[PDB]
Amino acid sequence: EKAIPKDQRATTPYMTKYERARILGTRALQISMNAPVFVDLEGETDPLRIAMKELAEKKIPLVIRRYLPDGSFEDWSVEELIV
Amino acid sequence: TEGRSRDGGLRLGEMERDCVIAYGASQLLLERLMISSDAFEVDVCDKCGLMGYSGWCTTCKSAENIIKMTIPYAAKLLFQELLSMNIAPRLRLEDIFQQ
Amino acid sequence: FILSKIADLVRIPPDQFHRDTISAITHQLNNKFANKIIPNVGLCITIYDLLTVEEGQLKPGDGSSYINVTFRAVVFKPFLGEIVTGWISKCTAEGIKVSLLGIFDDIFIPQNMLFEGCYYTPEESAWIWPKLYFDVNEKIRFRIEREVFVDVKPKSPKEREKPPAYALLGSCQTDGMGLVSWWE
Amino acid sequence: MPVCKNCHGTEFERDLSNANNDLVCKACGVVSEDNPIVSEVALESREATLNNARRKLRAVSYALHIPEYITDAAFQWYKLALANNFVQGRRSQ
Amino acid sequence: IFVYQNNITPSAMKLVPSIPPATIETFNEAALVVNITHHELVPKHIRLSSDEKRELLKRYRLKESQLPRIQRADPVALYLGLKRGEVVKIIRKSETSGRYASYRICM
Amino acid sequence: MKVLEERNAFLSDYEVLKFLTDLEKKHLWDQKSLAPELQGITRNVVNYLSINKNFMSDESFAELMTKLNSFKLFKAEKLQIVNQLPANMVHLYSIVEECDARFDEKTIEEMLEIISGYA
Amino acid sequence: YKGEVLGITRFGLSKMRDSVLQLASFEKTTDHLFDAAFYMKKDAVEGVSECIILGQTMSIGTGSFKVVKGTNISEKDLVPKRCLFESLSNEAALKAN
Amino acid sequence: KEVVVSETPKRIKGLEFSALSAADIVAQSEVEVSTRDLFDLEKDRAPKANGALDPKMGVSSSSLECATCHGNLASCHGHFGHLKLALPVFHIGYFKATIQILQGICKNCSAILLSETDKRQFLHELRRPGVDNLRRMGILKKILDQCKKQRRCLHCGALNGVVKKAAAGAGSAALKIIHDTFRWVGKKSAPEKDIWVGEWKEVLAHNPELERYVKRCMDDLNPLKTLNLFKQIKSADCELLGIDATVPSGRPETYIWRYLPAPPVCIRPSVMMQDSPASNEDDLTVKLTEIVWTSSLIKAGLDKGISINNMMEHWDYLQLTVAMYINSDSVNPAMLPGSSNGGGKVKPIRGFCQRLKGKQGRFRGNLSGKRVDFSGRTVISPDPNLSIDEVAVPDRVAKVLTYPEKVTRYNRHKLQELIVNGPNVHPGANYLLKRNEDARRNLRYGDRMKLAKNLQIGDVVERHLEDGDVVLFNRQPSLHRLSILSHYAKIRPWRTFRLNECVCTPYNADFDGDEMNLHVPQTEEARAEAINLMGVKNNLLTPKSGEPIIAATQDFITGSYLISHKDSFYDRATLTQLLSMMSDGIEHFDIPPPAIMKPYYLWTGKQVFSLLIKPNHNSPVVINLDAKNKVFVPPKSKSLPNEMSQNDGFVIIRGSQILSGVMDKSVLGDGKKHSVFYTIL
Amino acid sequence: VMTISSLEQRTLNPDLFLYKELVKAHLGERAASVIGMLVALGRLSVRELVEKIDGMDVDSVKTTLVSLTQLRCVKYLQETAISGKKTTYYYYNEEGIHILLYSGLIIDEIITQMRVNDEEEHKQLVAEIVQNVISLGSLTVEDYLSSVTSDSMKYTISSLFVQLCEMGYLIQISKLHYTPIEDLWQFLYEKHYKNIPRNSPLSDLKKRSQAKMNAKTDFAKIINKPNELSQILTVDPKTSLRIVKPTVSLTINLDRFMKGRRSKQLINLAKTRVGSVTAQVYKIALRLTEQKSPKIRDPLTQTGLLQDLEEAKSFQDEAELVEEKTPGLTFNAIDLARHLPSASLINSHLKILASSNFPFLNETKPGVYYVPYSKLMPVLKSSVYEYVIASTLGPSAMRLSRCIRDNKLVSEKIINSTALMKEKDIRSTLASLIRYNSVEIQEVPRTADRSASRAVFLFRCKETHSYNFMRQNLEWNMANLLFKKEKLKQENSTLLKKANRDDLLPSELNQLKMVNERELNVFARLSRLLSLWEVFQMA
Ligand SMILES: [Zn+2]
Ligand SMILES: [Zn+2]
Ligand SMILES: [Zn+2]
Ligand SMILES: [Zn+2]
């Protein structure tokens, strides 16, 4: 009942529909707190939209963690994952 | 408060509230039925869970084991309602991080 | 003095994410401890080492970063009886309350093993032995014996200092003690 | 009554424009309280005699078509009139 | 295993379950006329070996309990004579998708 | 938060002062950069630690063990010798159990010549 | 789901669900609370109509997975350091014992 | 100094229910209400010395401090109060449970009356690790009547019988309980009954009045005697009945009232003082403040005077009262009320169980149904020109409906400017909150300007609203998953909520006079939750049928039809202007070859509508499809393809050009799988 | 609030609240907390304990549990299911804390055997003996006498030799000695239903009473096996005198202490209604018969079997004759001048037996001077309550309660006549009596569906209750008191370690006298209670 090792993973490699949500929201919120922005920021502004702008580039540095029912945990890197 | 005249605010009914569940939004509820309506800090006591003001648990005089956390004021009002009537929603607590 | 291992959950705000992680962990830890005293052990000095930091788990409500770690930070924990430098600070009739410049005032050595023959006079010696009086702001070798951990944060709302949370005690059972030039 | 926690001015104004109803100082513009909480919606010889005297009193009142108002002023005189026990042994009328 | 004719006395169930190591199975005569497992709606059930459970539970990482429950003293139960802690693999053929299967534990 | 090993590693001050001074050099280096609140204790810490050395070395710590490993000092005075009292006469006798007792002449004396090797 | 066919009414809605607040969010709200606390029901909070009460997050949808940021560090900097305070002072206690 | 401060974020895991003990109450509240009521009329209007109201219990108006934790209505959550009560009044809440706990114990020696290891069997059955709540209750349903059918108790030697809950429903008897000597059958010897008749021989023969006329009452249990009885088995079984005793609660004795918990003032706020002395009471403030009275009656009573007859009916009135305090139930058991009565027959005396309970009460209509903040309500009106997934919002509710923003590093040269506008003009802000967490600064006094010249990083401003702010939008009684949607808001003049007609169908929006609800979110991550997940574009379909629920309706169909009408034609000027109007500007159109050539030039409607789909050559939309609009007319059956028909036909599209047939609902028409605005998606 | 009447510790804890202090106060920490769980939740198993206590499994439970067993504070029953394995389970040893709770009184057991050497080293000797025998557990004269010095006269140094028997002192305790009496009845319930020569399903009566009689008659020798067994008492080795078996471990008998202390309370009751001469006579009259009678011993199976509204009579009438005939042979018939200081001719002075009349003794076999018991002892105990509600509520209370004694269910209208006093008193001294229960209430609906005022009220006694919650006396100061002993200790706790190794300061000597008089109150206060306790809990 620990983190499943890197190679073997059982889950869809696609995003969920909800993943795209909380990734933006959380990321956008971290942008509104003064965090460095990795994508080149074009002349636009406001926290949420530059996050979308960033997820076009897969430059988000987060790891999404999936708990199966038993609590067998799980990991995926946002870069590693396909829209 | 209610309607026009007095002052603003609108209704989210259980008939409606369910809607956002289907979409699956957690954060929209916690913004909605929590942050934006009654945002409230209750000080509770881990040991023998009950509420309390500032530092004291007051059922067990401690000023030690209290933990500050937030909760809908309707929910507290539901406790002080209950606990008035004889019944005791004791709150067992655990930390979020690290299991 | 010594070095010890503690584990704690630490919060880095989004600001420092440019700065390297381990430095931010260090900075926040010093912000949390520094002078502050961890109870029933005795006060820290600063973070010394660091180790086994792992993937940090954030919370839905906020979105700052939360990483729980463990390490060894330098604390002040001497052994029991110890002859050590210091001087009387604020005292009237009892065993002298010594301090040490730039640490704390909480070392209090009462008079029990302190030499019996003495006389007290409103001057600067508390008690004068047959060998004599000493003076505040002086190199003074005094032994340590026991320590009192007290917490005492029982604020009863309508009471709106007594901070001996960590205090040490000893006495002078041998010569050269209370004035260093008696020995040497 | 209270003082600004910053400007230390005593002049407070409750802005009714935008349906906040905040209380603020005209000095530094800090608010005192937001969220303007508002409300909405035995055995005695003296209770018997008194309320009985609002009965008998109000009786003779609208008989004369006097203001019902004045009755309350008179009644309380009767109250003070009982305080000296002047009202005990005479004809109630 | 034997069958009733008409009456079931509560004296029969008073002590029905005498034998600890062995047991009874009791039916009404009328209760068996058409064979229920063979009927139409009731799909084919498979009693899976007691070891095969462990396999199953390790597939989905399911503990016990927390499975679809079949009540005991059920006509399909009785026909297949399930006991405590036994698991049946049901093949339900329903034309929306096709033939698929799901599991149930006897309680 | 939760504490694991309280009594853990007994740390006397040899390079500890030097190392704290090193971390200090990393941020702003105490008083003079002219040519966080953490600064408050450091100048304090280095204070009480510096005065006895005046009123230091690196290898002398490794030099210190050699003949000192031969004594009965256990772990207590064996650290204490580094700092308090000039390893002389009754000073060293004032601490450890059975200090003079069995072992006397070379044991109380060699502390003087070895402490002269550093202090 | 359970063995016997049931559900959806105020009676059948007490079937599995142990949550006393949702069975108390529905009907008979009084005696669910009383008769509940009499038997001293434990009542874990896993639900949804449950969690919206206490205002904590939800176990479905967006609330299905904790999200984590990579802390991005290697053990190379994590090795401790001392020049042995202990080991040198050790050998004074290693004899006459 | 300064010991380290440590905390860890916690969330609720489970709610342990229990009754409070008899002790824990008085171990809680600050002050006994006790005393009397009176609410001290003298000096101040009801300064409330001690008594039911009390400054150190809580407060009501924002006037005076709270004593224990003061600071008025801001920080005082209320405190409790504990009403001392003479004699152990019975309890209506746990009542029917008390009929169990008492149902299942012999009435003499009060040992659990099921016996031996059988009782242990009931135990071993419970603790089996996989037992759920339902299993529990069922097992209790067994263990209970298993002891019913017992007759004589095990080691007491005495017998017992049914306990019937005397009468029903009135409140006269409803709180009185009875068990009796039963199953005697009269032919067998009952030595007990022999004692029983011999008892009355000293009454009837003495006092013949009572005689046998009113008789056969057997006995009852004085709710006093029933706790003297509950005090027996103080361990042993316990849970066999249903109560874990590791004694946090300490057994089945607190079930019946002893110290009655007075609720805070903030639960029972005195109504506004209003003009003139009497402020309206607020329920609980009158009931228990009477319970104090009847209590201190029975305390001064039973002390010296009264009588065993004139004792009880008071005490009965006590349990009937407090029952009416936590419930309604019993209504008028031929009683009428006492001090502070009226008596014009005021029905809804119930103050408590119901405010918690039903219809739109607390629990549902209030806590789960919370009325919300940052909203708006308005009549609607169509706006075709506005795109989908926007809601035109009237600027006059945009001034007063604000969104929070944390200005950081990217926002300044907007926001340090956005303040200087001030709250009056639209593209601006009103409230401002510094990082120093004071309270906040309304923009009221003045400054700004030299105020905006600071605006540190972590500071918070509140924008009015702009184009692009994500706003979720609700309509009516909401039939299904599509009511709540979310739109990029765009600000316009006049006043009304303008959506695009295409989205009327999810709302089943009729226009006419119906009203809406406009909800902005607040926290930065609820936004990205809204437009991204709950927004229009991705929710373009329906949850149940996987079928397009937003499309052209009414004008859009028919107008499209009239362009699609095979009869129609156009010309390069007219067409050019159409193919423009379709997109207000902004686009590069490549005109395809005209349908017919020679006797002028023309372009058939299937083209001017076809280019709608693939305006550019770079618009990466390539379709193809067949369909059937309605009123399809079967062709000459010799012709197999239905495309050729008496009129129109299949709509068959290839290479994103329309080929045959008119369109007319169906293909663009909201609710058939095969469809254009479906297939494109 | 104010903590002086101490509510937190003051109500929700009856019964057990005693023990959880005793084992705490008298043993402490982990050793205590188990028994609290045991008594509270009843039957329990080794592993299952730690599911709750949070007591660091198979460490304390092992240590603490067997530690209790050595002091026999727990009951111990193990068996295996039919499925397999094996398992134990535990109960709290009957009273057994009874032993601890009495203690120095069980030391006062010396006074019976105090004869021969009177207030000698012999006193201090046997004192040390018994006070050690309770402290350890079962003892052996071999291993204890081994711990005792050799090379002195062993039957003398340890002179309690034939005196090891008497009534009290010791019995070899093994196995079936301490097992739940109930469950040993259930075990003996085998061999009878379990063993039937597969005869017929007909007439469970032959299956029952036969089995029960066999159960009963086999049960008899089960308790009489410990009663006395000669292979202990009889042993007379060479160069020696008659001794117990020095090998087997023997333990303090509780019931002969029970018996003997009960005799004292009868000496008190009679010490009222007769004269000091006749009293003292009766005081030595039991001393011959104080051995045999069961007191608390015979009801026995009355715990552990369902009664029968028929057969329970066959139990009670069995108790009616039990001590009367055959044990009557052991009882007073002709006895002469046991000690005594009346003088000169002692015979007619012995004829004083007839002076005993009410409400005890005063029967015999027709004309031999004898006292019945098997009728008397049972028909006696029912009287003993008496006072215990005189200073309590005031004397004016008794007579009306006492009045409610003779007649029954009697309305206060004719109470006002039968007893005598104005209303103003009767209302209080009754109401003041009813809150403390006893009298209880009856009522009848009078022209009512169910109503208060229009009805009429009656009273009663129902003595089971009235006796029963007088066991509040148990939780009363046998708990609160003993705690007021405990919380006192922490004041001088820092002094206690000093006074331990002392055998300084004037104020230390002052609080010495303070805490000492304090103590001498708390325990003598206890004995005052316990003397009032012995009645209710048993007999
Ligand atoms: Zn607490
Ligand atoms: Zn101000
Ligand atoms: Zn307060
Ligand atoms: Zn009974």
Author numbering:
A (entry chain F): 71 to 153
B (entry chain B): 1051 to 1149
C (entry chain G): 2 to 131, 137 to 166, 189 to 212
D (entry chain R): 1 to 41, 72 to 123
E (entry chain E): 109 to 215
F (entry chain D): 1 to 35, 53 to 72, 98 to 161
G (entry chain A): 1364 to 1460
H (entry chain A): 2 to 682
Study text:
In Saccharomyces cerevisiae, TFIIIB is composed of three subunits: the TATA box-binding protein (TBP), Brf1 (TFIIB-related factor), and Bdp1 (B double prime). TFIIIB then recruits Pol III, with which it assembles into a PIC and initiates transcription. To this end, we determined the structures of Pol III PICs on a tRNA gene at different functional states using single particle cryo-electron microscopy (cryo-EM).
The chimera protein Brf1N-TBPc-Brf1C28, which functions in Pol III-dependent transcription both in vitro and in vivo, was used in place of Brf1 and TBP. Local resolution estimation shows that the Pol III core region is very rigid with resolution mostly at 3.9 Å, whereas peripheral regions such as the stalk and TFIIIB are more mobile with a lower resolution (5–7 Å). The 6-nt RNA molecule seems to be absent from the active site of Pol III, likely being washed away during sample preparation, or being cleaved by C11 of Pol III. The positioning of Pol III active site by the mismatch bubble at around +7 relative to the TSS (transcription start site) justifies that the initiation complex is in the initial transcribing state. TFIIIB tightly encircles the promoter DNA in the Pol III ITC. The ZR domain contacts the dock of Pol III and connects to a linker region that inserts into the RNA exit channel and interacts with the single-stranded template DNA near the active site. The inner helix is the C-terminal helix of Brf1 homology block II (residues 632–649 in the chimera protein; residues 492–509 in full-length Brf1), while the outer helix belongs to Bdp1 at its C terminus (helixC; residues 495–532). Both helices contact and stabilize the second winged-helix (WH2) domain of C34, one subunit of the Pol III-specific heterotrimer C82/34/31.
